[PDB]
């Protein structure tokens, strides 16, 4: 795997690179490749470098100094913008499209909410599933909201904190594990007033145990 050079080692590497570039510039100036560097003049520096010529033509000297200052700013601004161009393409397509490397295992979290009659919470859950690229489904029934979400580990860790802490009748994760491949499609909604219609839909993808676990948890909560 990769190795991490220490802080002193980073300082040494940076110092050596800077000295190499400085020597490159110095030898270029020695051999006449580049013109010799001009003094860097700011407004407070104007009376020290251009002092004798700023009494004869003060405004020409001021204009020359400010042109040099702008050109120094022109290079820096252009450089930052030039590198910024990388994000232009490497942004929502290369700085926000990760997918958490979900290829060998899909973390699946099944939550059983008691009251999910608010459409705002379902819309926020659908937006969190579509933004984090986490597949799954949500089955509604009489005091039973079975929300299964299969995705990456980071998306599952985000959805475990969004549903239990960022969204408010209680929500409890009934099964948190991994699977071989994916079973559910995109994030859709389906209402089933009968338990058999939800169990037949959960058995179409081979996940009939999620409804039987949610029925058993409700039976164990209503028994005690």
């Amino acid at each position: 795997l990769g190795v991490y050079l220490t802080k002193k080692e980073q300082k040494k590497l940076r110092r050596q690179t800077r000295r190499e570039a400085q020597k490159e510039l110095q030898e270029k100036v020695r051999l006449g490749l580049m013109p010799p560097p001009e003094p860097k003049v700011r407004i407070s520096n104007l009376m020290r470098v251009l002092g004798t010529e700023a009494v004869q033509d003060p405004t020409k000297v001021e204009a020359h100094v400010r042109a040099q200052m702008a050109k120094r700013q022109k290079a820096h601004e252009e450089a930052n913008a030039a590198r910024k161009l990388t994000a232009e393409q490497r942004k929502v397509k290369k700085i926000k499209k990760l997918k958490e490397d979900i290829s060998q295992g899909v973390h699946i979290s099944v939550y059983r909410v008691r009251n999910l009659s608010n459409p705002a919470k379902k819309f926020k859950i659908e937006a969190n599933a579509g933004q984090l690229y986490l597949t799954g489904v949500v089955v509604l029934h009489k005091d039973v909201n079975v929300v299964v979400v299969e995705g990456g580990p980071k998306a599952q860790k985000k959805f475990k904190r969004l549903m239990l802490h960022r969204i408010k009748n209680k929500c409890v994760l009934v099964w948190e594990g991994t699977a071989k491949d994916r079973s559910f499609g995109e994030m859709k909604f389906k209402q089933c007033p009968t338990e058999n219609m939800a169990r037949e839909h959960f058995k179409k993808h081979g996940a009939e145990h999620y409804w039987d676990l949610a029925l058993s948890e409700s039976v164990l909560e209503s028994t005690d």
């Binding site: 407004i43 104007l46 009376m47 700023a54 009494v55 003060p58 405004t59 000297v61 001021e62």
Partner: peptide, 13 residues
Amino acid sequence: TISSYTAFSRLIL
């Protein structure tokens, strides 16, 4: 538009 140094220089001139 200009600093006080150039202002004073042109004023002296």
